[PDB]
């Protein structure tokens, strides 16, 4: 199999910037390198084929170069519509194979998350369940860590997290974290804490509540 | 007008088999290779194989040799891929595509699960009591234990958009859970009514949950 190594795996740039993505093949692919663009709605289009030939309707800011084993896709001046997932495909030998992809994002100014913590609803509690939820909203950059504590003790089992894709209008990211317990366990402890660690600060943003206190 | 039409989603049980369809239009596919590709969340795209409708020749990625069978129905200009002995590892988005002058379908999301259709529990998430001093307040809505996807979530019947984040669903157990937050200026709530509206078409349910202090 000709294995394709694509780099980088993610890339954050400013609109108007020149961006370049690479794919290295395991062995010579005789110029049969294609570049594909995939949008958040799942739509996939061919941009360049045979290393440097632009497909129908692709704007001239996209160009491809390379030979033998080393290939590149370059976008001259990044536009908003170019924010997408890009992947290469070798068509030089069977089986055809793909690079692992490059997700582009818009770079913006750093932003600390806004953190909010929510105790279980009375409606959930009446059913025997107890979910504590934490929203970590509108931060940049993308990486972040959340730690839960029960009475000051770190808790890992029972946590589920979800992360939004980069916001279309403001370029931030958001995350939800839910600690789900039984009502019985929830009622045995008093303090519940969501702690967020992000590049914008060396001290964690801590949010918590006490089950008695209302 | 050079379209490849695939169904948006298929739900099947483990051990079953499924036949994905790819209807071509705006061109006659006779001399185009018709490819199938598998995409999963954190994996690189995988090429499954391709079939040339004119003579029925196939080229397969050997990893999928006992899993996938490619065929074509020239009279309806449709390509098919049959997947057998489905496991949860087969859950993925499957695309068809033609080449040369490549063009791709929109992909079929295949879910392989034993779960039964189940309506969500919807719970209002009000701020911790005491007193919040900010100029804004964040409220939420937790949608737990439903199957299959999707659910549609809106605030104030869609009139409140803006300040809203709805997170992607995740699979706790064999069921899905999602949540949404809404942020509003503190003077608006609780004086103005804010309610979460959740629809889950498959169980035909529609629930409204008002956020109360």
């Amino acid at each position: 199999d000709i294995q394709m190594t694509q780099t980088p795996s993610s890339l954050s740039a400013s609109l108007g910037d020149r961006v370049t993505i690479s794919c290295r093949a395991s062995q010579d692919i005789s110029h049969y390198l294609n570049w594909f663009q995939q949008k958040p709605d799942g739509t996939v289009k061919l941009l360049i084929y045979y290393t440097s030939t632009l497909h129908s309707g692709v704007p001239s800011r996209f160009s491809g170069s390379g030979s033998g084993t080393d290939y590149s896709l370059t976008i001259s001046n990044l536009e908003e519509e170019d924010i997408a997932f890009y992947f290469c495909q070798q068509g030089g030998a069977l089986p055809f194979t793909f690079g692992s992809g490059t997700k582009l994002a818009i770079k913006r100014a750093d932003a600390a998350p806004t953190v909010s913590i929510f105790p279980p609803s009375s409606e959930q509690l009446t059913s025997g369940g107890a979910s504590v939820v934490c929203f970590l909203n509108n931060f940049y950059p993308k990486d972040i860590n959340v730690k839960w504590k029960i009475d000051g003790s770190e808790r890992q089992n029972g946590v589920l997290d979800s992360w939004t894709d980069q916001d279309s209008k403001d370029s931030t990211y958001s995350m939800s974290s839910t600690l789900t317990l039984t009502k019985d366990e929830y009622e045995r402890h008093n303090s519940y804490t969501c702690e967020a660690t992000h590049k914008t600060s060396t001290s964690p943003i801590v949010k918590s509540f006490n089950r008695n206190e209302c | 007008q050079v379209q490849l039409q695939q169904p948006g989603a298929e739900l099947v049980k483990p051990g079953a088999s499924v036949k994905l369809s790819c209807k071509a239009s705006g061109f006659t596919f006779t001399n185009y290779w018709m490819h199938w590709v598998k995409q999963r969340p954190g994996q690189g795209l995988e090429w499954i194989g391709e079939i040339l409708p004119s003579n029925g020749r196939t080229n397969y990625n050997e990893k999928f040799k006992t899993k996938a069978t490619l065929t074509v129905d020239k009279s309806s200009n449709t390509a098919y891929m049959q997947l057998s002995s489905l496991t949860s590892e087969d859950s993925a988005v499957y695309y068809c595509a033609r080449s040369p002058s490549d063009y791709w379908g929109q992909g079929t999301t295949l879910t392989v699960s034993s779960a039964k259709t189940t309506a969500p529990s919807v719970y209002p998430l009000a701020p911790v009591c005491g007193d919040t001093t900010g100029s804004s307040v964040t409220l939420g809505c937790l949608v737990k234990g439903y199957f299959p996807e999707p659910v549609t979530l809106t605030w104030n019947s869609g009139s409140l958009s803006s300040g809203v984040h709805t997170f992607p669903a995740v699979l706790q157990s064999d069921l899905y859970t999602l949540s949404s937050s809404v942020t509003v200026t503190s003077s608006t709530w609780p004086s103005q009514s804010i309610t979460c509206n959740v629809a889950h078409p498959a169980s035909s349910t529609k629930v409204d949950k008002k956020i109360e202090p």
């Binding site: 005789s30 294609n34 045979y50 068509g91 069977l94 055809f96 | 290779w33 040369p100 490549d102």
Partner: peptide, 7 residues
Amino acid sequence: SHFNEYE
């Protein structure tokens, strides 16, 4: 775009 077809 592939070695086994005419482009």
